[PDB]
Amino acid sequence: SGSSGAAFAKILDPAYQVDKGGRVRFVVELADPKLEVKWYKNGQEIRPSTKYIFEHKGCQRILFINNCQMTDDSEYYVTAGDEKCSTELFVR
Amino acid sequence: SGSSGAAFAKILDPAYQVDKGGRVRFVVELADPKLEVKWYKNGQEIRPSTKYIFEHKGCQRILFINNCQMTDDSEYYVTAGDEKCSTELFVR
Questions:
Q1: In angstroms, how far is CA B83 from the centroid of its own chain?
Q2: Closest-approach residue (CA) in chain B for A86
Q3: Where are the domains positioned within chain A?
Q4: How far is it, in rounded angstroms, from Cα B65 to Cα B50?
Q5: Lowest CB count within 10 Å: A13, A18, A50, B62, which one?
Q6: Fold exhibited by the domain A1-92
Q7: B88/A2 CB distance under 8 A
Q8: Any coiled-coil ranges, and where (chains A, B)?
Q9: In terms of Cα–Cα distance, which of B86, B53, B48, B89 is closest to B70?
Q10: Is A59 left (phi over 0), alpha (psi -120 to 50) or beta?
């Protein structure tokens, strides 16, 4: 059963919004504080840069997207273990 | 912006569980009571059968999976408009 593979103590909200030029913060909580996660934008892996800042605080895994523009208006997902959850970012 | 495409008033819960031989009920709520939805099991469209019963009550879109077995332990998603949400079903 997929039950033995549960990895998310807290998943992403269904959707988030942000004003143009603003910053959005995505947060998920893992059961295992040592488990690694990967973030994706519309299916392509996101990596640390000036647009994307990643933080790891114990069980929390955070992704900040800076200077949000319409190019950032998209679906995003994060993987942990054999699971994944997604969200939609709406840029105003 | 994807904001003008929002179609889910209520999305699926992150995960559901069910006992072997039991029945599970998935429910989502659309903003538009006339909008059609499609359900998928691990990426393949689910159709009305004895295993799958679909109900439409105003804005609510429901899917019942009967006689759940380990074969039903899987990821599922539903689409509405240009959006989709997913969930995991754990069979005990």
A1: 13
A2: B85
A3: 1-92
A4: 9
A5: A50
A6: Immunoglobulin-like (2.60.40)
A7: yes
A8: none
A9: B89
A10: alpha
Name the method of structure determination.
Answer: X-ray
Inter-chain contact B90–A2, Cβ cutoff 8 Å? yes
Chain A closest-CA separation from residue B14 CA (Å): 8
A1 contacts B90? CB cut-off 8 A: yes
Alpha-carbon distance A65 to A25, whole Å?
Answer: 7
Q: Look at residue A74 and give its three-state secondary structure.
A: strand
Q: For residue B45, give the amino acid letter.
A: E
Distance, in angstroms, between B70 CA and closest chain A CA?
Answer: 7
B33 vs B31: CA distance, rounded Å: 6
Burial class of residue A51, CB neighbours in 10 A (0-12, 13-18, 19+): middle
Q: What is the resolution of this structure in A?
A: 1.5
Q: For residues B74 and B64, what is the distance between their CA atoms, to the nearest angstrom? A: 14
